[PDB]
């Protein structure tokens, strides 16, 4: 069943657009910033070369949005959270933190 769930996800990822945000939700050290940035880049490579997804430069034009934290950690002033808030107050994009994403990609058979 997880095997079937992976094959369904794998086939669907070939027809998905992924966006990786540049905004950090909160204050971190230069070390924590660097570690996240490295993972973001590794994740971008997994989606484009292994999962075969399209990489979108506009998060408003993508199916899955990779964040530098949880959406609840993002400030009200941030464009990514302003966009998120609209999709709640209107009846379809996905918002995954890098940690959530890293685990999903592990579940796809790819470990950073």
């Amino acid at each position: 069943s997880k095997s079937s769930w992976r094959q369904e996800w794998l086939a669907n990822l070939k027809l998905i657009s992924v966006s990786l945000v540049d905004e950090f939700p909160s204050e971190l050290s230069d070390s924590d910033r660097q570690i996240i940035n490295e993972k973001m880049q590794l994740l971008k490579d997994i989606f484009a070369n292994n999962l075969k997804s399209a990489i979108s430069n506009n998060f408003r034009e993508s199916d899955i949005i990779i964040l530098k934290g949880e959406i609840e950690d993002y400030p009200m002033s941030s464009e990514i959270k302003i966009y998120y808030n609209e999709l709640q107050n209107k009846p379809k994009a996905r918002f995954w933190s890098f940690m959530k994403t890293q685990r999903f990609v592990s579940n796809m058979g790819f470990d950073i």
């Binding site: 997880k2 992976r6 669907n12």
Partner: peptide, 9 residues
């Protein structure tokens, strides 16, 4: 196209 991101429990 909108199946769960989390594996089945």
């Amino acid at each position: 196209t909108d199946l769960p991101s989390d594996p089945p429990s």
